[PDB]
DNA sequence: CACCCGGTCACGTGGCCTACAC
DNA sequence: GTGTAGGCCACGTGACCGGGTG
């Protein structure tokens, strides 16, 4: 009876530990995908979050800019294709 | 002496506690901020911490991958671009 | 219906460290 | 030296909510 509560209590503990350990693993995993946070580093959890949050934003900005460049090159290409098209019609 | 030992311990005890609230509260704030930057996890205020981690890691990887593709495309277009310019250049010297 | 179960959370606490002071 | 103040962490421990099962 009293022993039962200790058994429930203890199993709760080891349960919470395991859950907690998974959360740790996830922290280290996230950390390894942030370039600033190196391939190891002893970085506090709050830092890992804030840098991840920032990094995501930084990569977003890069992505939009790359897209702009892509669309820009496509404008130039099609412009050149159009110019080269008019070098065949005008070369009798 | 006596209980002044214990009186000191309670003080460190309380100040340590109130510190941990601030730190935890900040740690909470960082979690919500990260979560809002993950498209899948946006407009979902009730998101577990472990998910926010796993998806962030996942999202970062996909966007890394996407990024690499975009770059490769640029190199492809820029390759074609300069090729078109070069064909067009010596078709100008040979069209008098 | 009530009763647990698996998941999640915040909290109080002490154990470590790093660095800064006596 | 011997502190000691701060920051980070992982632990234990209650409470919460959720979907089943009896």
Distance from C-alpha of A36 to C-alpha of A16, rounded to nearest angstrom? 31
Q: Which residue among B37, B66, B74 sits closest to A56, beta carbon to beta carbon?
A: B37
The 10 Å CB-count burial string (b at 16+, else e) for A3-21 is eeeeeeeeeeeeeeeeeee
Distance from C-alpha of A92 to C-alpha of A76, rounded to nearest angstrom? 26
All structural domains of chain B? 1-96 (4.10.280.10)
Give me the A residues in range 15-54 that sit within 7 A (CB) of strand C: 15-16, 19
- On the CB side of A52, how many CA atoms lie within 13 Å of its CA? 34
Instruction: Name the experimental technique.
Output: X-ray
Q: Which residue among A62, A70, A76 sits closest to B67, beta carbon to beta carbon?
A: A62
Of A39, A64, A82, nearest in space to B84 by CA: A82
Beta carbons of B70 and A63 less than 8 Å apart: yes
CB A29 within 8 Å of CB B57: yes
| The residue to which tokens 């979690």 are assigned | B31
Supply angle C-alpha A25, B20, A15, rounded to 5.
40
Stated resolution in angstroms:
2.7
Of B88, B84, B73, B89, nearest in space to A76 by CA: B84
Q: How far is the CA of A17 from the C1' of C6 (A)?
A: 14
Distance from C-alpha of B41 to C-alpha of B47, rounded to nearest angstrom? 7
**B73-79 contacts, C-beta under 8 A, 24 or more apart:** B73/A70, B74/A66, B74/A69, B74/A70, B74/A73, B77/A70, B77/A73, B77/A74, B77/A77, B78/A73
């Amino acid at each position: 009876m009293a022993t039962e509560e200790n058994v429930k209590r203890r199993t709760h503990n080891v349960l919470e530990r395991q859950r907690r350990n998974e959360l740790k693993r996830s922290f280290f995993a996230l950390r390894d995908q942030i370039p600033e946070l190196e391939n190891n580093e002893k970085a506090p959890k709050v830092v890992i979050l804030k840098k991840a949050t920032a990094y995501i934003l930084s990569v977003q900005a890069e992505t939009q800019k790359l897209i702009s460049e892509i669309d820009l090159l496509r404008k130039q290409n099609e412009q050149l294709k159009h110019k080269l098209e008019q070098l065949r019609n005008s070369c009798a």
